[PDB]
Design a protein around this nucleic acid. Sequence first.
RNA 1: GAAAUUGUUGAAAGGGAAGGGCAUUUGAUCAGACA
RNA 2: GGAAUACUGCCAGCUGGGACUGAGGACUGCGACGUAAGUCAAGGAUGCUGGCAUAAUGGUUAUAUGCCGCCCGUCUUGAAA
RNA 3: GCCCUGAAAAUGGAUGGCGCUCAAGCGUGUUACCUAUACUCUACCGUCAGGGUUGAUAUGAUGCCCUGACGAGUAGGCAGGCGUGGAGGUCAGUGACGAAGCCUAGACCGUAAGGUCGGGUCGAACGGCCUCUAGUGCAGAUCUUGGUGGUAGUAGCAAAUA
RNA 4: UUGGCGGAAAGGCCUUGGGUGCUUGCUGGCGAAUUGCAAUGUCAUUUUGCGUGGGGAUAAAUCAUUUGUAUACGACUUAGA
Lengths: 156, 127, 197, 106, 49
Amino acid sequence: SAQKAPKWYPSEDVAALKKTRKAARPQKLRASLVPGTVLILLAGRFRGKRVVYLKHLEDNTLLISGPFKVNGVPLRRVNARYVIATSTKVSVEGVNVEKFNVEYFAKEEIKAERVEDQKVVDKALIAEIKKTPLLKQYLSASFSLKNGDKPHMLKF
Amino acid sequence: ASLPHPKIVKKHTKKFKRHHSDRYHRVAENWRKQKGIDSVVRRRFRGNISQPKIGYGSNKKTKFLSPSGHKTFLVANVKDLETLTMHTKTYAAEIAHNISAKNRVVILARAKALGIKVTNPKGRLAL
Amino acid sequence: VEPVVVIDGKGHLVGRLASVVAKQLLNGQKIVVVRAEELNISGEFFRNKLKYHDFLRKATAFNKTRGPFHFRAPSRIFYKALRGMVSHKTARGKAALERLKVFEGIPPPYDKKKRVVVPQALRVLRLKPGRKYTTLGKLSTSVGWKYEDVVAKLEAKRKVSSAEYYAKKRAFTKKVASANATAAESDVAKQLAALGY
Amino acid sequence: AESHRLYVKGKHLSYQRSKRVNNPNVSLIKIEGVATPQDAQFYLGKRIAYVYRASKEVRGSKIRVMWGKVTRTHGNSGVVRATFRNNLPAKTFGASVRIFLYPSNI
Amino acid sequence: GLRSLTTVWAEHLSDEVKRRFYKNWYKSKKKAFTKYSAKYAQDGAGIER
RNA sequence: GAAAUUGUUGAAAGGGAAGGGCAUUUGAUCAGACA
RNA sequence: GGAAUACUGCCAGCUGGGACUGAGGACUGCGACGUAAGUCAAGGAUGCUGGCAUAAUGGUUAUAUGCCGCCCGUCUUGAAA
RNA sequence: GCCCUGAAAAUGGAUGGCGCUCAAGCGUGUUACCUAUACUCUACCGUCAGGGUUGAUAUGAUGCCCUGACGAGUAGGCAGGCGUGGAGGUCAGUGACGAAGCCUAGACCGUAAGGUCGGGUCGAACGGCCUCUAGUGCAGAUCUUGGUGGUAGUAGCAAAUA
RNA sequence: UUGGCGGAAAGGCCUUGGGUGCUUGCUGGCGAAUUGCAAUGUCAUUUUGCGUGGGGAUAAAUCAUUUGUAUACGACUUAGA
Ligand SMILES: [Cl-]
Ligand SMILES: [Cl-]
Ligand SMILES: [Cl-]
Ligand SMILES: [Mg+2]
Ligand SMILES: [Mg+2]
Ligand SMILES: [Mg+2]
Ligand SMILES: [Mg+2]
Ligand SMILES: [Mg+2]
Ligand SMILES: [Mg+2]
Ligand SMILES: [Mg+2]
Ligand SMILES: [Mg+2]
Ligand SMILES: [Mg+2]
Ligand SMILES: [Mg+2]
Ligand SMILES: [Mg+2]
Ligand SMILES: [Mg+2]
Ligand SMILES: [Mg+2]
Ligand SMILES: [Mg+2]
Ligand SMILES: [Mg+2]
Ligand SMILES: [Mg+2]
Ligand SMILES: [Mg+2]
Ligand SMILES: [Mg+2]
Ligand SMILES: [Mg+2]
Ligand SMILES: [Mg+2]
């Protein structure tokens, strides 16, 4: 024999885990995040864009709209830790967002229903934006840091 | 394809080389404890090589485990291989260095039938 | 914040300026020092002249070309003080010293650029009035610097050209200010004032 | 516009060290515009990326990144301590780093 | 220190000076100052400037 | 048919020695799981 | 004559940001919240999601950079000598 | 009190260096900050101590498991292990379809002594485990024998007429 | 493209004229999605090499020989179509 067989062989069965005392409780957002607030994206394909926050989803994500007709940002999800909440707020009453949920953004060219629902949501938002001067132009521009800007001193 | 285990941690991956084994050819790298009265290695002065000690011992739950999670067992023939028939999730067979080319074919065929992992299946392969 | 910072050495204490510049170089900032002949050193002229003589008598006994090298130019005197505050024998120290340039006067590459000052090293803000101080240009001449008159003549020519530029710029600034003054009291001007601008 | 920057410029100063011993696991970072520990509290937890170039391309790019995070403040002059997944190389003493605005508490 | 700004040479040079510019005078084609002499071929604008 | 020592070829570094410890960059090279 | 505030101390008062750690592996204990069923932050981490599945992580090796590192053995109160 | 005179040594020179003058000096007071193999908490290794568990049908009661504390070391003591030549037993062990040896900035295991595998070279014997035995482990002793360097294509190869 | 100025390392600065693109000074109309909830998400300047074509220019040094104003050897200084 090349090697003597072990006298004792360990067990081959897998023990079950102990009961875990970790109950999931709903996330609470920071006070600055209110529906209708203008948000500044900090990362991703649309980094620097200014979008409108609409609804909080079940998966701790935020539903946002550009609107797509203004800056080209469609209805998407963003992480709450990757946005900056400004003080500018747009009225959100009159916008139907109950249809959008986690399964609506399921992964599984462009889907026909997504385009149609984009125009329905944007129609109400754009009407509200027109009542504030320079608001449409503000959402079209992109945010950036200039020389001498101190983020710890800037007020949004 | 082995039993679940905690992450394997190595406290000291670097080899312990004998002092001044890189200075003279007559001094091998096999570890030897310096016992000189004035030796800076024995006295543990800052900036010198580290010495092996029991504090580096690995966790007993992952000791002797290969990165795949199996323990190595040396096998010379089919009968030795069949010892691991009911221990396929903890032991892997390794063919001895002095096994002929024709006898390795029989062992590899038997090991695949029993589901026993082989760590060196390409040895003496006439491909 | 500038990619290159140009420091006017006039009225600066050599030691306090050297410590500031050395830290800037090690942090990755390029520094250019001009008018090194106008640097100041605390203490009367005789004391600093005596100190340089003590430096002059130090040399390798068996070969004078091996010992310490005594540079007489004002720019190199400031360089010596600066190199003593940097670990110049390391690769990191060598890289830092390559970010520094010292000149007597203001050479043509920098005479049309902006020059700044270092308040921490300013003689007028640091020394108590009545204390004696020495000008680096005069000290260098007494120890064997040959180009004091040449730099003085070139500096006089540069100042004449700079004065003409300022007179032209000042006239243009007056016209621009008047345009802004008459553009005030408008609707746009009032809105800017409400927002701080 | 002419500018697209979404980060704060920073400099890699050195490792955490005593007079004669250094600790490469911790790096000291200087953030532009911060000159007080109270101001430096804003940047705690922010992600840090070091961006450098290489001649060889591997995953469709010749640019490589080393990621880190601000952990705590350092001294009285706005310097902060940072830790990276792999320690920053010593040749980067005096090089530029990027301090991002995420994760965001605003 | 003093620095030389420009040097202006005469139109014609004898073989005595041209030998100073060669190490193998007997093998050379004696092309020295041939293109410089063309500066005088004009009215003299290059030399006068 | 080992070492000291040597030739050729290949790779790399070198401003008054070389060699070493901790950490990472770069180059080269390589194992493990695709359940 | 009537208060306020500073200073010192206490609260089994409330609350925001950052870092490091996740050891254990059926149940058993002590409590909390509830009429009850039960639930819980109560004798040690779980849930959701994305990219990649290969030299990407990692190992080895050469080199570079920051800091540190004097030649071993021996006698000796004391050795780089 | 501070400063100055008193105050002279041999290579060039040292508050550690640069340099510093309402100091970056001297006396004193108040806070912030930096960092040891020390202190606090957690993980892992080992040691010691106090305990639990024989019940068959699944293998080690020298087993497995729970709890707490501890860890510097020359001369020196003790303990547990690694490696070598030979011997009894066993694996009806490996091998000319390639044993042993040697080379290999290739891979794996062990805190370590070491063990294992792949590739190249090679040609006839050799190994694991339980025990027995010793002419059993080298860096030094102006150590023994043999081999080989730098010095170095260097010193030199110039008396006696050609 | 007109002219002037700048030699401390000038290699830059200012100015004339017209051509052309853009203009967010103001008002409009279309486009963006799918990089799927972040991943530098690649936009800079260093050097050199190999193929294109539009111009420009057609040499020297060394060895060997020779000289002695030189010389241990190298070096130096002279000559030779
Ligand atoms: Cl180094
Ligand atoms: Cl071992
Ligand atoms: Cl000669
Ligand atoms: Mg001793
Ligand atoms: Mg002189
Ligand atoms: Mg032979
Ligand atoms: Mg050899
Ligand atoms: Mg790696
Ligand atoms: Mg040292
Ligand atoms: Mg004695
Ligand atoms: Mg000794
Ligand atoms: Mg004091
Ligand atoms: Mg001990
Ligand atoms: Mg063999
Ligand atoms: Mg080798
Ligand atoms: Mg034979
Ligand atoms: Mg013996
Ligand atoms: Mg020996
Ligand atoms: Mg010995
Ligand atoms: Mg000997
Ligand atoms: Mg000879
Ligand atoms: Mg002789
Ligand atoms: Mg003779």
